């Protein structure tokens, strides 16, 4: 949907030209980190990456977790996938 999301929410981020993957939503930048224009901060778990994608691009993990629950051809499998439903705030460690 177009509706915005909340900080630290579990949602499968879909990168242009890539399958769905369980990531974590981040908060706004300090104010001078060059924020997005029509997208939100998406912290890719397992790969420690970050991609900017709008709401219509990101879907609820509640729908993907029921599909396979884990990545098929995506690196990072079993590397933070169980934390998405347990320790979603591992980035801080």
From Swiss-Prot:
Tissue expression as described in the entry: Widely expressed. Expressed at high level in the thymus. Expressed in fetal and adult brain. Expressed in neurons, but not astrocytes. Markedly elevated in fetal as compared to adult brain. In the adult brain, expressed in the subventricular zone (SVZ), in hippocampus, and undetectable elsewhere. In the fetal brain, expressed in the germinal neuroepithelium and cortical plate regions.
Domain of life where this protein originates: Eukaryota
Domain PWWP: from-to ranges: 1-64
Cross-link Glycyl lysine isopeptide (Lys-Gly) (interchain with G-Cter in SUMO2), where in sequence: 75
Post-translational modification: Citrullinated by PADI4.
Signal peptide: none
Subcellular location: Nucleus
Described function: Transcriptional coactivator involved in neuroepithelial stem cell differentiation and neurogenesis. Involved in particular in lens epithelial cell gene regulation and stress responses. May play an important role in lens epithelial to fiber cell terminal differentiation. May play a protective role during stress-induced apoptosis. Isoform 2 is a more general and stronger transcriptional coactivator. Isoform 2 may also act as an adapter to coordinate pre-mRNA splicing. Cellular cofactor for lentiviral integration.
Associated disease: A chromosomal aberration involving PSIP1 is associated with pediatric acute myeloid leukemia (AML) with intermediate characteristics between M2-M3 French-American-British (FAB) subtypes. Translocation t(9;11)(p22;p15) with NUP98. The chimeric transcript is an in-frame fusion of NUP98 exon 8 to PSIP1 exon 4.
Subunit organization: Monomer. Interacts with IFRD1/PC4. Isoform 2 interacts with SFRS1. Isoform 1 interacts (via IBD domain) with POGZ (via IBM motif) and CDCA7L (via IBM motifs). Interacts (via IBD domain) with KMT2A (via IBM motifs) with a moderate affinity whereas interacts with the KMT2A-MEN1 complex with a greater affinity; MEN1 enhances interaction of KMT2A with PSIP1. Interacts with fusion protein KMT2A-MLLT3. Interacts (via IBD domain) with IWS1 (via IBM motif), MED1 (via IBM motif) and DBF4 (via IBM motifs).
Family: Belongs to the HDGF family.
Protein name from the UniProt record: PC4 and SFRS1-interacting protein
Lineage: Eukaryota, Metazoa, Chordata, Craniata, Vertebrata
Residues of the whole record sequence present: 1 to 93 of 530
């Amino acid at each position: 949907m177009t509706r915005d999301f909340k900080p630290g929410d579990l949602i499968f981020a879909k990168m242009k030209g890539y399958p769905h993957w369980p990531a974590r939503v981040d908060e706004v930048p300090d104010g001078a980190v060059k924020p997005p224009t029509n997208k939100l901060p998406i912290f890719f778990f397992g790969t420690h990456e970050t991609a900017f994608l709008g709401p219509k691009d990101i879907f609820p993990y509640s729908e993907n977790k029921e599909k396979y629950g884990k990545p098929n051809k995506r690196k990072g499998f079993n590397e933070g996938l169980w934390e998405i439903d347990n320790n979603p705030k591992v980035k801080f460690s």
